[PDB]
């Protein structure tokens, strides 16, 4: 419950993105954190290994780690 993670590469990139007020689709490797509410509004191209899925970040995303707004497995059954 102490210092949470932060994704320092994504942290450096995110700050640059919001200082310039520029919004850009991001091809992001990171499945591990949506750390601050500074990430709100930025589109994240989440990488499940194989392709990048665009994810809009809103106010409810805070507290859910970044990777599984995009799922890694596919199942139908028939």
């Amino acid at each position: 419950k102490k210092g949470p993670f932060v994704d320092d590469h994504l942290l450096k990139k995110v700050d640059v993105q919001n200082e310039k007020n520029t919004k850009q689709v991001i091809k992001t490797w990171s499945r591990r954190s949506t750390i601050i509410p500074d990430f709100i509004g930025h589109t994240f191209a989440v990488h499940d290994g194989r392709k990048h899925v665009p994810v809009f970040v809103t106010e409810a995303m805070v507290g859910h780690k970044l990777g599984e707004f995009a799922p890694t497995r596919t199942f139908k059954g028939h």
Partner: protein
Amino acid sequence: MKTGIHPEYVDTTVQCGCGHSFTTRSTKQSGTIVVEVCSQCHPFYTGKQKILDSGGRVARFEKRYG
């Protein structure tokens, strides 16, 4: 009103826990109602509490407090 088929219909005295007392006609044989509810509706308060219930970004900033 027909005579014998209707149930007996008596005055009553309704009392709540705060003592706010009500006098009515009623069907109770006891002649009284010892109730726990008075004209103190909690919807006004319950609704406010429910409205107050949402909002979690603040809670997160709570855990993290800087």
